[PDB]
From Swiss-Prot:
This is Potassium channel toxin alpha-KTx 17.1. Belongs to the short scorpion toxin superfamily. Potassium channel inhibitor family. Alpha-KTx 17 subfamily. Keywords: Amidation, Disulfide bond, Ion channel impairing toxin, Neurotoxin, Potassium channel impairing toxin, Pyrrolidone carboxylic acid, Secreted, Signal, Toxin. Disulfide bonds join 4-20, 10-25, 14-27. It comes from Olivierus martensii (Manchurian scorpion). Its main location: secreted.
Amino acid sequence: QTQCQSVRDCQQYCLTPDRCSYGTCYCKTT
C-alpha cells in the first residue's frame, strides 16, 4: 500500500511536500 513511489508523486499532489515515506506522501503544510 504505497500512495507514492517518490517525492515526485507528492510534488504533483502538494505544492510543498514533506516526504514520500511510509507509503503515504506526507505534505509539510497542507
